[PDB]
Amino acid sequence: GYTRFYRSPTASVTLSGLVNVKWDNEQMTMPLFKWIGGEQAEELHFCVHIAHSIGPKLNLARTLGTVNSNMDQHWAQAHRHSGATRRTIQDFHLFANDIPNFPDYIKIKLVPK
Numbered sequence: 850g851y852t853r854f855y856r857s858p859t860a861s862v863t864l865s866g867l868v869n870v871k872w873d874n875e876q877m878t879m880p881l882f883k884w885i886g887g888e889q890a891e892e893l894h895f896c897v898h899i900a901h902s903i904g905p906k907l908n909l910a911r912t913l914g915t916v917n918s919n920m921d922q923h924w925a926q927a928h929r930h931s932g933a934t935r936r937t938i939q940d941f942h943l944f945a946n947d948i949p950n951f952p953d954y955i956k957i958k959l960v961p962k
Contacts, residue, residue, distance in 0.1 A: 850958060851898075851900055851956035851957065851958050852864055852956070852957060852958060853944075853954040853956060854870055854880060854954055854955050854956075854957050855946075855951075855952045855954040856877055856938075856952045856953045856954060856955070857952045858874075858875045860872060860952075860954075863885070864897075864957065864958060864959045865895075865958070865959045867885065867886035867895070867918075867959065868882050868883065868884060868885065868886070868895070868916055868959055869882070869883045869885050870957065871924065873926075877938065878937045878938060879913075879926065879937050879938060880913070880927075880938075880955075880957065881924040881925060881926065882897070882916045882920055882924070882926075882927060883920060883921065883923070883924050883925065884916070884917070884918050884919070884920045884921035885921070886918060889918040892917055892918055892919055893917060893918040893961070894915050894916075894917045894961075894962040895915060895916050895959040895960060895961055895962060896912050896914075896915055896959070896960040896962055897912065897913040897914060897915065897916055897927050897957055897958075897959060898910040898911065898958050899911050899912070899913055899942055899955060899956065899957050900942070900944075900955070900956035901941050901942060902942065902943055902944045904941045911935070912931075913929075913934065913935070913957070914926070914928045914929040914930065914934050915927060915928045915930065915962065916928070916959070938955060942955045943955065944956065
């Protein structure tokens with residue numbers, strides 16, 4: 850399922866045991882990804898799905914682009930394949946914290962391709 854990635858510059862999470870996530874910078878305009886799953890024979894690809902909190906079709910996951918098992922040396926932006934793929938985090942990706950005054954989060958998960 851989805852992992853909460855909090856909108857706090859120090860937030861960092863791991864997705865599916867394979868991919869570490871952090872913010873690009875302090876304005877938190879997008880997440881960055883690094884493969885931490887160790888060596889793969891063939892290159893493996895994953896869609897990074899993201900939930901919407903408001904607006905149309907809330908049960909439909911959107912995509913940030915793809916990450917792969919070769920993004921293992923440097924932090925990477927998701928690789929975008931459509932012009933429709935949002936590059937930056939928007940208000941419609943944000944969920945209010947369970948506890949008032951603590952940060953919002955986005956919901957992201959890896960989907961094998």
